[PDB]
Amino acid sequence: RLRATVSRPVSHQRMGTPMVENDSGYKLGQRVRHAKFGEGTIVNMEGSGEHSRLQVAFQGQGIKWLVAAYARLESV
């Protein structure tokens, strides 16, 4: 029915998605997946909530800082 969704092949992830057992903050040791940086392991994090930044060790590059609210990582 010509729905106005994203034309980018990406699952719309955000704080408030109808995901069963959705996180309220990423946990350390979790494996993440992102088409921008690849897959990584969250080794550290800063703060909590929207201003939370995650230090993700991407095995294809290195540790990066991802602002949790805008990061929106998918769990492997």
UniProtKB/TrEMBL annotation:
Could you name the domain of life of the organism this protein comes from?
A: Bacteria
Q: Which family does it belong to?
A: Belongs to the helicase family. UvrD subfamily.
Q: What is this protein called?
A: DNA helicase II
The range of the complete sequence contained here reads: 645 to 720 of 720
